[PDB]
Amino acid sequence: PKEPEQLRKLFIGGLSFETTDESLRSHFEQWGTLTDCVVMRDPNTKRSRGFGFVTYATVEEVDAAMNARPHKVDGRVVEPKRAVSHLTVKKIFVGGIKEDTEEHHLRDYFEQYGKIEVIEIMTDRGSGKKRGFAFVTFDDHDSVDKIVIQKYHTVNGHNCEVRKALS
Ligand SMILES: c1cnc(N2CC[C@@]3(CCOC3)C2)cn1
């Protein structure tokens, strides 16, 4: 059972124009088996477009590569991101938590996706009653990107709806 290829891909932005298929592969093979690795180039000049893609054999290998950031590739710090499902944010909306879900429920669950900086459990402006949704802010976008591709999120026995949240 192979994970869908789309979930095993990293877009790599900010490449040095001297990075090649081969040097990008040599770099990112340190964190897993690469089934594909390409530098995007102009069709006429062959000059690099400054970005590429790598595809790992498993999602755990994608995780390993993201956890090894920052990546300096051929002398330049590059910008890896998981393929789109890019709206790059650090904050999620968590809905369906009802009125019994507390901060530690959200923290104990979401801390395994990334480092949490803010948890905001929403309350009614007039009564102070919990409204049944929350916002979690992380220190980095990959946490959110991992979270929103999951089909399900179970927190405090609730099946939650989780979406990217923007400013
Ligand atoms: C994260 C960030 N960017 C991504 N894009 C994919 C290729 C792109 C669209 C067409 O040309 C450039 C940019 C994907 N995932």
Numbering used by the authors: 7 to 91, 101 to 182
Source paper text:
The human heterogeneous nuclear ribonucleoprotein (hnRNP) A1 is a prototypical RNA-binding protein essential for regulating a wide range of post-transcriptional events in cells. HnRNPA1 ability to carry out these wide range of functions is encoded in its modular domain organization consisting of an N-terminal unwinding protein 1 (UP1) domain and a C-terminal intrinsically disordered glycine-rich domain. UP1 is composed of two RNA recognition motifs (RRM1 and RRM2), which, despite having a high level of sequence similarity and recognizing similar optimal motifs (5′-YAG-3′, where Y is a pyrimidine), are nonredundant and functionally nonequivalent. Using the XChem facility at Diamond Light Source, we carried out a large fragment screening on UP1 protein crystals.
Fifteen fragments were identified to bind to the RRM1 nucleobase pocket, all interacting with key residues in the two ribonucleoprotein consensus sequences (RNPs). Interestingly, all fragments identified on the RRM1 nucleobase pocket formed van der Waals interactions with the conserved F17, F57, and/or F59 and frequently π-stacking with F17 through aromatic rings or similar heterocycles. Earlier studies by Vitali et al. showed that in the UP1 apo structure, F17 and F59 have correlated alternative conformations, with side chains adopting (i) F17A–F59A orientation (RNA-bound conformation), seen also in the UP1-DNA and -RNA bound structures and the only conformation seen in other RRM–nucleic acid complex structures and (ii) F17B–F59B (anti–RNA-bound conformation), not frequently seen in other RRM structures, including the RRM2 of UP1. Fragments binding to the RRM1 nucleobase pocket modulate these dynamic features by recognizing different RRM1 RNP conformations. Three fragments (Z1373445602, Z1401276297, and Z106579662) sit on the RRM1 β-sheet in an orientation that closely resemble that of the purine ring of the central A2, with their aromatic rings sandwiched between F17 and H101, stabilizing the F17 side chain in an RNA-bound conformation but not altering F59 dynamics. The authors also highlighted that these local dynamics are influenced by the conformation of neighbor residues and the binding of RNA is essential to stabilize one uniform set of conformations. This is consistent with what we have observed in our structures, where the binding of fragments on the RRM1 nucleobase pocket directly locked F17 and F59 in different sets of conformations.
